[PDB]
Design a protein around this ligand. Structure first.
Ligand SMILES: [Ca+2]
Length: 68
DNA sequence: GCCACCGGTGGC
DNA sequence: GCCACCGGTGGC
């Protein structure tokens, strides 16, 4: 389920998806959804989309929390 | 053509 | 040996 992510700017949501088949079955992937609905799979991709005005240095992609 | 899904690996 | 990061792609 897509859950609100207050660590991000307004509108952002986070989803954890459990892999269903293959040797990695049971592994989790984390996705973030922009307010406009675009999907992001890594902190570099996320940071490039948001740009310099948003400080993600303390941002922990896997947990979705600021981890300082 | 798109994209959800799993596999591969460079850097640590 | 692990995993952040992203490539390949089958099913639509
Ligand atoms: Ca916020």
């Amino acid at each position: 389920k897509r859950m609100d992510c207050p660590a991000l700017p307004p509108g952002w949501k986070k989803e954890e998806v459990i892999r269903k088949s293959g040797l990695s079955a049971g592994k989790s992937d984390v996705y973030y959804f922009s307010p406009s609905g675009k999907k992001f799979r890594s902190k570099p991709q996320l940071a490039r989309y948001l740009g310099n005005t948003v400080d993600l240095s303390s941002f922990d992609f896997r947990t979705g929390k600021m981890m300082p």
